[PDB]
Amino acid sequence: HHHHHHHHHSIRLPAHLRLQPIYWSRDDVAQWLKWAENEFSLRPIDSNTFEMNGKALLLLTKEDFRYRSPHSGDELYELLQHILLGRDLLEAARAGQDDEVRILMANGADVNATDNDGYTPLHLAASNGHLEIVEVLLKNGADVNASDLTGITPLHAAAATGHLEIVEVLLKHGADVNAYDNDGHTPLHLAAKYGHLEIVEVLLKHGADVNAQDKFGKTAFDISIDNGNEDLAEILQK
Ligand SMILES: [Cl-]
């Protein structure tokens, strides 16, 4: 157990590009070209070769990109596709649209797509209780331990929200039972905070450190007492 990070190789967009491409302004298109040239080590791109907004970019075909940028146009086109499909997959995972998740993966969506808060599809499916999507994403190679910008992993999310079956599946697929977020909380702390006694028991059986202390100086036992949950306090003592 450790402080996890984003999945290495996932596309993480800069601040001006947090919105969906349909909302990109003319300025945002120019910023995207500059960011892409650096992130992907491309030949120099003249910003005046795409004098348009994001809606316009979305109408261009790959051939149009190549005409505008012989050296990098196809890469820019595929980068935009990855951004679009990644968002589609994040949304389908959040919403519990099992078929759409399957279809998007068959069409090349990145299983480790990451939004601007660092959430992956697996994190959104875990938080929202969508067990079948968690299983599909894991079967497609999702990073079980990739954490959001606050250090929260999928296992943290499932433990906090009370989805025991998802907790079990994540553990079976290698989730770090002792992952710590930026406030020093482990999954055990969050299961205790939200009163999920059965999850506490599973985490303990899989090696959770009952004595882990968060940045406020508290263990899971302390959190349970703070909430007046003597049921949970007793499990943690015994
Ligand atoms: Cl160019």
Ligand SMILES: [Cl-]
């Ligand atoms: Cl081609």
Ligand SMILES: [Cl-]
């Ligand atoms: Cl064309």
Ligand SMILES: [Cl-]
């Ligand atoms: Cl994305």
Ligand SMILES: [Cl-]
């Ligand atoms: Cl007590």
Ligand SMILES: [K+]
């Ligand atoms: K990286």
Ligand SMILES: [K+]
């Ligand atoms: K950002």
Ligand SMILES: [K+]
């Ligand atoms: K497109």
Ligand SMILES: [K+]
């Ligand atoms: K393509």
Ligand SMILES: [K+]
């Ligand atoms: K399983």
Ligand SMILES: [N+]
């Ligand atoms: N289990």
